[PDB]
Structures are given as C-alpha cells and as structure tokens.
C-alpha cells in the first residue's frame, strides 16, 4: 500500500492519477488476502488499525462524500470503500464507481460485516473461537478494541488468556518444496510455527520505521541497518523488524533474523514474547519506534540505550523546559495559550514575531 503526504501539501490536487504522488510504501505478508491487507493497513503508519471509518453513520451527507471518494480516488479510498459497505452500498455499487475487482471488494465487505458483529456482541461475545476467526482475518487488537469499546490491552489480554498467538512462517521462494536456512519470517494465525528461535545467543532487536514518508526517510533506515551490521559483526544475534519493501534493512542479508512485520506494539510484542531478546533498539527508526517506547517498556521489553522516560523528557515541551531551566541554558520565550485573547496577551509578553505550534 502506497504512503502519501498530502497533508504537507497545501493547494495540491490530491486525487490519484498517472503521475505518482506517493512518498513511500508499506508491505505485508499474510496467509490470506484479508490478513495480508489488514496487516498492511496497520503497518502504514497513518494511525489506522485496519478499516477505521472516515465518515459517521448518522451523517445524512455521507453517501455523497463516500461516492465522491470512490469515484475519484485519493489516498483515502480504501477506508471509504469500507464506509460505503457500512453505509448500504452494494459490491456492484462500489465496483461501478471504482473499477476495483469484486474479488477484492467482497473481501472488504466481509470484514465489515464481521466488524458489525464485533460491535454487536461487545467484548463479552469475544470467545476464543470468534476471536481466533478474527485474528485469522487479520483483525488488529486495536481495531477490535475500538469496536468493542475497550482498550487495546484488553484484547491482547484476552488472547493471552486463550493462548491465542500467531505462528511465524518463512519466505522460501518455493511454497515449502525445499527447506530454507534463512530466517525471513511473517506472522499469521495458523498451526505450525517456523520461528525456531535460538536459545544459543544474546539477541538484539532493531525496530525499523515502516514506510518512508517525508521527514521519516532512508536516513533512519540507514541507521537501523548499521546497528544490525555492527552488532552482528560483534557477535550478537541481530533481529530486524520492519515492513518497508524498498529498504536494505528488509534485505534478508542484512541481519540474522528478519521479521517482515508491522512495526506496532502488537506485532513487536509477539516477537519479543518468543525471541526473548536481550535488548531492543527503538531509537533508530524514527518516530514510529519512538512512539512505541513507553508501551514496550511497560510491557516488559528490554529497551536499550536512552530510556523511554529520558526521551520523553526531551520530547515533552514542559518536562523539557524544566531541564533547560535546570541547566540554566537559553531557550526562546514561550507560552502555552488556550484561548485567542489569551494568546494576544501572552504574545505581547513573548514578543513578535512568533512561532505558533499546535
């Protein structure tokens, strides 16, 4: 799935056409189309957890917006395809507007009906059989969480409870006709696992950044690759986690074990669960891994280097000012306004010109 950055482009026509406008891409592997697609969605680094809705069910205007989005595609179409199903549109309906093969549409439609049940039954209706069926369809804990009205951790808890975890298959070029000595894996909900992790060494896991986007480029990938080459050479078992098809970090040669996965909490936790690595680097893949840092740590992950908390100390404008202060250093005049008049007042204090950061 391509990755766009229209939000950074004011005045830009944002409809998709023959001239590329995407800034990157994400890849996913799954045992079924459905699983594959949803995994890609949650790994797109756009805040999605699957088919999250774009328009409300009560907006009497929805059908209109939806139609438009389907007929003349933008970066958001896939989500509007699901909202169309939610809104009453037929598979033929959708087809006529998008020309996207029904083979794909029927599958999106099915996910939608499934989301509806989820919604209907709530967490309470999430028994092991159903939940497994969901997971197999590639549903994220997060997306499920949302439908059921609970936190993501809740779904995850439930899985733990049911011992509902994915298995890892390997990429081999040959549909398993010949064995592989390489460890290029993807998760799925099936029977047999091929992870076969080593008990032998000290493992280091490196988290990549997902698809590239503006400000989150190859520079980070570069760093991630480097961590791996270095630590490997030094004798660590290096594990790379990423899902950008364009990069060297996703080259099997780059590391000992490669997990071509969404760089999310859910996905990262599963691997950790089984790899039981010595350390995890979250500082080299950009914002993506950075943001995962606290939850990972909290979930028991042996995060190495600069601590989540320290990173937060620096990132957090308030916590931070306080450091600057502490060290008696020079920071530009600042204020935290809430209301307009408030800001005009404070502005006065601070002094123009000003930098207005949301």
């Amino acid at each position: 799935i391509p990755r766009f950055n229209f939000e950074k482009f004011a005045g830009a026509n944002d409809r998709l056409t023959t001239q590329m406008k995407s800034v990157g891409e994400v890849m996913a592997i799954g045992r079924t189309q459905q699983e594959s697609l949803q995994k890609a969605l949650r790994g797109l680094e756009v805040g999605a957890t699957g088919f999250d809705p774009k328009v409300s069910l009560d907006d009497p205007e929805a059908l209109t917006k939806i139609r438009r989005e389907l007929k003349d595609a933008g970066a958001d179409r896939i989500w509007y395809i699901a909202d169309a199903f939610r809104a009453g549109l037929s598979v033929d309906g959708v087809f006529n507007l998008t020309n996207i093969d029904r083979w794909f549409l029927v599958q999106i439609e099915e996910l939608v009906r499934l989301e509806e049940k989820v919604a209907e039954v709530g967490i309470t209706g999430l028994n092991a059989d159903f939940l497994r069926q969901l997971k197999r369809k590639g549903f994220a804990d997060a997306r499920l969480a949302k439908l059921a009205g609970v936190r993501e951790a809740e779904i995850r808890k439930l899985r733990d409870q049911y011992d509902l975890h994915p298995v890892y298959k390997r990429v081999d070029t040959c549909a398993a006709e010949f064995a592989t000595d390489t460890a290029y894996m993807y998760s799925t909900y099936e029977e047999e696992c091929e992870a076969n992790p080593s008990t032998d060494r000290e493992k280091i896991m490196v988290l990549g950044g997902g698809p590239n986007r503006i400000g989150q480029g190859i520079e980070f990938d570069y760093c991630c690759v480097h961590a791996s080459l270095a630590l490997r050479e030094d004798g660590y078992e290096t594990i790379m986690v990423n899902c950008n098809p364009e990069t060297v970090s996703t080259d099997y040669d780059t590391s000992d074990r490669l997990y071509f996965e969404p760089v999310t909490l859910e996905d990262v936790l599963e691997i950790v669960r089984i790899e039981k690595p010595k350390g995890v680097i979250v500082q080299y893949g950009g914002q993506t891994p950075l943001k995962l840092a606290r939850a990972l740590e909290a979930a028991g992950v042996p995060v190495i280097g600069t601590s989540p908390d320290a990173i937060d100390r620096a990132e957090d404008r308030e916590r931070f000012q306080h450091a600057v202060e502490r060290l008696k250093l020079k920071q530009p005049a600042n204020a935290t306004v809430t209301a307009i008049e408030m800001a005009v007042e404070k502005a006065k204090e601070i002094g123009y010109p000003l930098v207005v950061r949301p």
Partner: protein, 375 residues
C-alpha cells in the same frame, strides 16, 4: 458449521471446513505448487486416487469452465486447500469451485494449514490420508481408513482411467478469441497417430492435433498387433496415474513397436513405460514432482525449461540401458527427465509439455514421423 477433517497415516490431523461433497475420501496425499490451473489439475487423470493439496492459499478465484477440463471428469480423490474465495471473479467462470466440487461429488476441505501439511510431506515423503466431511467427522475412522489404504506403490491405475473402446480425437487447442475449435476433419490432418490412453490429458492431444495429427485413442491394453494393423504414422504413449511397472500389457506392446521402425513418443507415464520396455528400471519418488515451475535442463542444448510436473515415480538413471541416451534432467533434484533410444526413433519426456502454440519435443516427434513417411 460444515466440518471436515483430514487425517494422515501417521496420525496427523487437520481440522477445517467442508467445501465439497459430504462423505469420506482416501488416497495418497500430495501437494502441488501451481499458483494457477487448479481445475486442470483436478481433472488430470494423473491424479486418480490422490488427495490433492494446493500450496497456493486462495483456490477457486476464477471459478471453473469446461475448456479448463483436462478430462471428462475430476480425477483427484479429494482437494485440500487453505482458503476458498467468497466469489469466483473471471469472465471465463461458469460455476464456482464449491458447486463444481459438489456436482462432481468431490470431498474437499478448506481452512487448514497447507503449509504445515506440505512441509510434512516434503520432509517425510508422501502419506496416505483420509478426509472426512460431514456432521461429526470421526477422526479414528479417518485414521483407520488412511492406514488401510493399500497405497500407490505397485498399483496399476492406468487400466482404471483408460477408455473402454478406441476412438478418434481431431480437436485442437483453445484460443482466447474462439475458445475450443471444432474438431477437424480427417482430410484435414496429414498424420495419423495412435495414442495409448494411460490416462491422457486433453491438452496434449490438442497439441498433437495442432501439429497435423489425426489421433486414434486406444485403450491401455491394446495389443501391438492390433495397433500396427492400423498403419500408424506414429505412436504416442500418454501420461497417466499410478505406477508404470505393473503395466505388463503396455511394456509388452511397446517392445514390439520397438522392433519396428515406427516413431514412438512418450510423455510422463509413457516415458516410464518406454523406459521399462527398454530395460530400464523405475522408482517411486519420496514425494514426487507436482507443480508448474520445475526447471529441467535439456543437456544436449544446455538450456533450461520451466516445466509442469505431475508424477510420483521416476526412471532410475543408474540402470539405464546403453541404448538409452539421457536427454533431460531436473535442475531441482537431478532426476531423469528425458531419454532417447540410440537405435530407434523413440524418445520420451517426464514432464508435461504445453502450447504457445519451444515445442522441441513435439516438433521432434513430428520430425521423426515425416522421415518415416519419407521412407
């Protein structure tokens, strides 16, 4: 819930869903790596008594149609797959997979870890298995049945699939534009080839016709005398299921031809027969060759062909008589894929040739036919 179950000789179980007829199925379990062509595989006589597992997860994406039928019927004993699509999506489809399976009374199962099954067959070799589909599938029953299965080793399957009476075939290849062509008329074909039906596929026949051959399809047991009586321009030995060895009938016949100067061409089972009749020995493969990306080297030419394989036995190179020159070998496993008689106009190929419509095998055959009529 429509349950289904598959159980291996060894006790391995795979729980899933029924997508074909109700009931049970037993046979030797194989995996096929083809990403496309499921229909053709199902309807290939080469799969008689076999339980076909497809490694490609979504099977049934394009539904089915008559033109994609390799024989008058489904030869696979059962079908085992990972996912049956919600819909068939293709202009050529005339009936979805599931309905098709049912119409043909095939027991099929979906939703199981085909990868694990594949890796098991790969690692431990083929195994007999049984699939049961219905209300409350009995795993013990399944296991019993699987274990009880006699097995393909030493089993003559060709006599099972061959036609009962002889008959003509003058229908050529399919085209996108006009589908399957009308059958040609006899004065419309220069050559007359006698083809032994050891469970032959429609596409080979169609190919031969494409090349000028009027064909007379004969039962597997047909005597050499009976045939020779027809003054054949060439003799063709089809592909087919099971073990070649117990095909006493064929070997005998073939030897006769081999005394003669009549060009003889064999594919797959035919190739094995030809080899047997030439004094070679056949073996049964760990798991076989079932797919459509198998690299084979033409040793003579030093070129690689990407082929279709559908076999579980093979000709042992080490016992190759000296009147048998090796022409092709598997780049996957080094196994024998081609041979030619150094003393006779007879050659054969292990894999299953297809139409473009480089046809070197075919063209050779045709070539030999001509020389033969030139005489």
């Amino acid at each position: 819930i429509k349950s289904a179950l598959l159980v291996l000789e060894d006790g391995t179980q795979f729980h899933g869903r029924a997508i074909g007829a109700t009931g049970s199925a037993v046979g030797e379990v194989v995996f096929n790596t083809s990403m496309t062509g499921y229909q053709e595989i199902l309807t290939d006589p080469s799969y008689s008594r076999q339980i076909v597992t497809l490694t490609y997860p979504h099977i049934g994406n394009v539904g089915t149609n008559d033109a994609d039928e390799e024989s008058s019927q489904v030869h696979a004993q059962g079908l085992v797959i990972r996912d049956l699509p919600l819909i068939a999506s293709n202009f050529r489809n005339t009936e979805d997979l599931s309905s098709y399976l049912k119409r043909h009374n095939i027991v099929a199962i979906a939703d199981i870890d085909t990868r694990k099954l594949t890796r098991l067959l790969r690692e431990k070799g083929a195994q007999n298995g049984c699939i049961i589909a219905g209300d409350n599938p009995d795993a013990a029953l399944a296991l019993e049945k699987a274990r009880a299965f006699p097995g393909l080793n030493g089993m003559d399957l060709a006599k099972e699939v061959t036609t009962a009476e002889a008959y003509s075939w003058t229908q050529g290849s399919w085209t996108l534009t006009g589908g399957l062509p009308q059958a040609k008329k006899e004065d419309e074909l220069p050559f007359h080839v006698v083809a032994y039906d050891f469970g032959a596929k429609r596409n080979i026949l169609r190919m031969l016709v494409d090349r000028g051959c009027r064909l007379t399809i004969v039962p597997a047991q047909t005597s050499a005398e009976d045939v020779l009586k027809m003054n054949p321009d060439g003799i063709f030995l089809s592909n087919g299921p099971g073990d070649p060895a117990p095909c006493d009938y064929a070997i005998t016949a073939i030897q006769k031809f081999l005394e003669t100067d009549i060009p003889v061409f064999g594919i797959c089972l035919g190739h094995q027969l030809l080899a047997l009749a030439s004094g070679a020995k056949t073996v049964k493969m760990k798991f076989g060759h079932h797919g459509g990306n198998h690299p084979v080297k033409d040793v003579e030419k030093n070129v690689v062909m990407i082929t279709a394989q559908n076999h579980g036995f093979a000709v042992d190179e080490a016992t190759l008589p000296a009147n048998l020159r090796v022409t092709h070998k598997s780049l996957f496993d080094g196994t024998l894929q081609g041979i030619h008689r150094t003393d006779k106009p007879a050659f054969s190929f292990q894999g299953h040739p297809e139409a473009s419509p480089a046809a070197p095998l075919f063209d050779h055959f045709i070539e030999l036919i001509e020389q033969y009529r030139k005489t």
